[PDB]
Design a protein around this ligand. Structure first.
Ligand code: PC
Length: 175
């Protein structure tokens, strides 16, 4: 497939991400994630914690500089009113952890899509704690808009997440 795989950073596109959503099949709530690594060094998968939903693939174990990782997620199958929400992390060659969060609620009635990235000192794994850290911190909304910011440690991040049941999220970490 495409998810659980890495590709040349330069080739990461919305087209690539939408094709990821396709392989997930007709499921009302899903997300396809793409992260381009341009930090200067390699990344190593730590883990993924799902608040809601689940995933069908593995976190690309290795992400070398200039390469982009591909990942996906979705709500639980069946008559269950739930979305796709989680946080996952990658260990960096600088010795710090990169943390990512995405939330795609079941009922877009009251709720919306939310996401964020953050770098944790040392080595930390994704948990209900990191999830709450990014969710209830100051996450970006999946407003189909691009956002950027300084990640500290001299990295900077550029990103975007769509606002809908079948979402796509594209991020980039530069040095
Ligand atoms: C919508 N959600 C239940 C997945 C996230 C938590 O929302 P809230 O209980 O803080 O308002």
């Amino acid at each position: 497939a495409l998810a659980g795989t890495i590709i040349a950073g330069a080739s990461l596109t919305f087209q690539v991400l939408d094709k990821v959503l396709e392989e997930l099949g007709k499921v009302s709530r899903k997300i396809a994630v793409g992260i381009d690594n341009e930090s200067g060094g390699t990344w190593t998968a730590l883990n993924a914690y799902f608040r809601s939903g689940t995933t069908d693939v593995i976190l690309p174990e290795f992400v070398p500089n200039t390469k982009a990782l591909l990942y996906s997620g979705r709500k639980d199958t069946g008559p269950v009113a739930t979305g796709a929400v989680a946080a996952f992390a990658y260990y960096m060659s600088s010795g710090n952890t990169l943390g990512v969060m995405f939330s795609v609620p079941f009922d877009y009635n009251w709720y919306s899509n939310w996401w964020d990235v953050k770098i944790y000192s040392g080595k930390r794994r994704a948990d209900q704690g990191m999830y709450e850290d990014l969710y209830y911190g100051n996450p970006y909304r999946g407003d189909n808009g691009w956002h950027e910011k300084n990640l500290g440690y001299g990295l900077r991040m550029k990103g975007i997440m769509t606002s809908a049941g079948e979402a796509k999220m594209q991020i980039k970490i530069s040095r």
